[PDB]
């Protein structure tokens, strides 16, 4: 009996298959070819983030692009002000090892986790002044992979079990758990409407929800290797993702197809991280041979190399303002380029 | 230069001097590994050598040096995404039953996939072969490794094994029971000797 | 939260006290704190500056060399000694606390304070002291400075407060553009980098009371004489 649903899955799938390939009529090469080209933006470090004592994993923008969150592997949560260099607060973790780290759009909570599948978030506006623990979301059983503030009182979170949860900042508890996957989840990225969200998991697969229905509407299959970087487009209708085989691909949940694929012979090295412009034309990707490459979402091609680094580049933020780029590395160096 | 300027600027300098504090205690502890599968004895490794929560930290100070040691107890045995965590640390201990014939394939296969990982080489790994007692017990094997019948002592099996495996960073393979009061001074000798390669090899003095 | 001051009473001309602010409730080490002297129907002048960890102390040029003041992190009280007790010294003394950072909150509680009786400058002169306006309107106080206090950065550096008869000051605004926590959003802040207007819509019998104000643009800081309302 399972093998008769097994089968007509497969035929469903195959169908699926065939009509996604059956409405592509021209692809985006041939429209984007009489486009005037980029030329080459060679960025320069502005300033200089040397504050934290370990490798720096992750790091997040908010609304102002002054203040600027980065967490490392030993524990110190550091947001710092992007301007002229001050450091605003160090929380200290009460684990070492952190894998993502968030900044709310009010500047009121911040957001860190990893493997300690315990999400510990902190307060910024506090009358005492110094930073007390407000919420310890618990529940989880695998490592949070990527997490982010969707409002000043809900947010998604991932971890390492294949699954989603929506939690309360008030409640503390999961409103809402999203299907598990068949890979463990790496990172995950919100629309700017706040009406839905794109997560990558292991297993070369990209899941759309929602934040009220915990359905997935939209699936992408088009890798080989394991996803460890998605971002999500600012028109809200299109999404670039990355695996370790050093192809980036931009998908679209209108069409349900590949619209750009950013690669190259010469570079092996997978990505960590992604995020587009404040517009969305540069695309720069963080690269793990000791420097990045930023690409062209339309032309596809690379539009200048920031060799400003000596290490595994960790991650990558462009800020919402579009006026600075936060890349960190593991060599406790989180440079500012623009 | 406004007044609230400087003293953001002065704060700044308190916060990079308490940081500079915390890197030294840092650097002045020893970050390891522990590894194992469900069979493995690192229960009694943690519960007699110690001188949901998805990982564990254990922290002891023994010959004037604190060592920190993280082991996963309620994470996925997947170890290719979350194993980039544990970049650049200084050792990991890697535990074995050699008591259970049935599950010393899967062991050895596990590592074998932990040793040739690309995120893990230049970390060092020491192989623990707990229940030594049972397992001299047990043997007072032929069937799972056929090679035992051929191979004879020099003038061991599972160390010469687990030798093969690995030099297909250099592995410390010893031997541990629940009842070993001195393993804390040999993973001392082993780490020490660790940070004596790793500064050689950093010195150009190899 | 809790600012306990002690050390006052009458004092011969001449003598030495030792004022302590014992503070419960938050961070002592990482807040900044401050004196301010209020005389008898007079505003607040400053003494002391002290930021966190001891590293730099700035004094008033007028009492210069009088005073000495000192935080003590492990029982978290702060002292403030002084010798030389003048005619003038004879004020209200208040121990404040305040945090500097990028959108901070400086002077945002103020100490209960205790009595005490004995035997370039930024001059902020406002534009109209006396207002008697009866509760329930829109009004809208100006003043003035003799200095532009806008810097370079674009941080308008300047603190409206409020000392209604009994409570000690309340802080308004962080930099004309930003209000505080625990207050009403009928006040706001406006005007250029020389005059300011503060504008509240509708008046209550609570909230009426004297509005201070005060300059942080360079090291000594100044208190205006404030919307002093006679009448």
């Known amino acids: 009996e399972l093998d008769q649903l097994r089968q007509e899955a497969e035929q469903l799938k195959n169908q699926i298959r065939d009509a996604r390939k059956a409405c592509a009529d021209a692809t985006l090469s041939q429209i984007t070819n009489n486009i005037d080209p980029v030329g080459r933006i060679q960025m320069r470090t502005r300033r200089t983030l040397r504050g934290h004592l370990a490798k720096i994993y992750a790091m997040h923008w908010g609304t102002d692009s002054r203040l600027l969150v980065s967490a490392s592997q030993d524990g110190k949560l550091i947001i710092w002000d992007s301007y002229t260099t001050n450091k605003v607060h160090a929380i200290p973790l009460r684990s070492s090892w952190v894998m993502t780290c968030a900044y709310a759009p009010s500047g009121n909570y911040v957001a860190c986790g990893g493997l300690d599948n315990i999400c510990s978030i902190y307060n910024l506006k506090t009358r005492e002044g110094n930073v007390r623990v407000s919420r310890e979301l618990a529940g989880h059983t695998g490592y949070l992979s990527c997490c982010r503030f969707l409002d000043d009182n809900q947010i998604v979170t991932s971890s390492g079990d294949t699954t989603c949860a929506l939690w309360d900042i008030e409640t503390g508890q999961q409103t809402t758990t999203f299907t598990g996957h068949t890979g463990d989840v790496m990172s995950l990225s919100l629309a700017p409407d706040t009406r839905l969200f794109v997560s990558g998991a292991c297993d070369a697969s990209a899941k759309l929800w929602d934040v009220r229905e915990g359905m997935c509407r939209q699936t992408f299959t088009g890798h080989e290797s394991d996803i460890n970087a998605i971002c999500f487009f600012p028109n809200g209708n299109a999404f670039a993702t990355g695996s370790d085989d050093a192809t980036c691909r931009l998908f679209d949940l209108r069409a349900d197809q590949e619209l750009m694929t950013y690669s190259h012979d010469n570079i092996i090295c997978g990505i960590t991280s992604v995020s587009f412009s404040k517009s969305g034309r540069l695309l720069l990707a963080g690269y793990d041979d000791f420097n990045c490459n930023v690409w062209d979402a339309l032309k596809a091609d690379r539009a200048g190399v920031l060799a400003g680094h000596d290490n595994r580049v960790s991650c990558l933020g462009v800020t919402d303002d579009g006026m600075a780029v936060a890349t960190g590395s593991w060599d406790s160096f989180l440079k500012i380029w623009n | 230069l406004s007044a609230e300027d400087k003293a953001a600027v002065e704060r700044s300098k308190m916060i990079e001097k308490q940081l500079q504090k915390d890197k030294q205690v840092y650097r002045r502890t020893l970050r390891l590994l522990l590894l194992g599968a469900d069979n493995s004895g690192k229960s009694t490794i943690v519960k007699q050598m110690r001188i949901t929560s998805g990982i564990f930290e254990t922290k002891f100070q023994v010959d004037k040096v604190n060592f920190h040691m993280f082991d996963v107890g309620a994470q996925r045995d997947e170890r290719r995404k979350w194993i980039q965590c544990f970049n650049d640390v200084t050792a990991i201990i890697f535990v074995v039953d050699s008591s259970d014939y049935n599950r010393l394939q899967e062991a050895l296969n596990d590592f074998k996939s932990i040793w040739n990982n690309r995120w893990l080489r230049t970390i060092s790994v020491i192989l623990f072969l707990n229940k030594q007692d049972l397992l001299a017990e047990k043997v007072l094997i032929e069937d799972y490794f056929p090679e035992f019948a051929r191979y004879t002592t020099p003038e061991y099996f599972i160390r010469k094994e687990f030798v093969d495996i690995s030099t297909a960073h250099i592995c410390y393979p010893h031997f541990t029971c629940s009842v070993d009061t001195e393993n804390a001074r040999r993973i001392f000798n082993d780490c020490k000797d660790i940070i004596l390669q790793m500064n050689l090899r950093e010195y150009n003095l190899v | 939260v809790q600012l306990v001051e002690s050390g006052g009473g009458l004092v011969q001309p001449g003598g030495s006290r030792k004022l302590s602010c014992s503070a419960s409730?938050?961070?002592?080490?990482?807040?900044?704190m401050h004196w301010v002297r209020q005389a008898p129907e007079k505003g607040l002048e400053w003494v002391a500056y002290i930021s966190s960890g001891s590293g730099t102390i700035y004094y008033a040029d007028t009492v210069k060399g009088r005073f000495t003041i000192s935080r003590d992190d492990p029982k978290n009280t702060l002292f403030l000694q002084m010798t030389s007790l003048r005619s003038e010294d004879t004020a209200m003394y208040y121990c404040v606390r305040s945090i500097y950072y990028y959108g901070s909150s400086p002077f945002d509680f103020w100490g209960q304070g205790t009595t005490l009786t004995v035997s370039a400058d930024i001059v902020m002169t406002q534009a109209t002291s006396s207002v008697p306006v009866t509760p329930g309107e829109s009004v809208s106080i100006s003043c003035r400075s003799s200095?532009?206090?806008?810097?370079?950065?674009?941080?308008?550096?300047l603190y409206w407060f409020l000392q209604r008869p009994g409570q000690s000051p309340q802080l308004l605004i962080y930099?004309?553009?930003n209000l505080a926590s625990g207050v009403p959003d009928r006040f706001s802040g406006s005007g250029s980098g020389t005059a300011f207007t503060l504008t509240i819509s509708r008046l209550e019998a609570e909230d009426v009371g004297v509005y201070y104000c005060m300059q942080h643009l360079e090291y000594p800081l100044t208190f205006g004489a404030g919307t002093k309302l006679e009448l």
């Open positions: 930099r004309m553009s």
């Open positions: 200095k532009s206090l806008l810097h370079s950065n674009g941080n308008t550096y």
């Open positions: 409730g938050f961070a002592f080490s990482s807040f900044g």
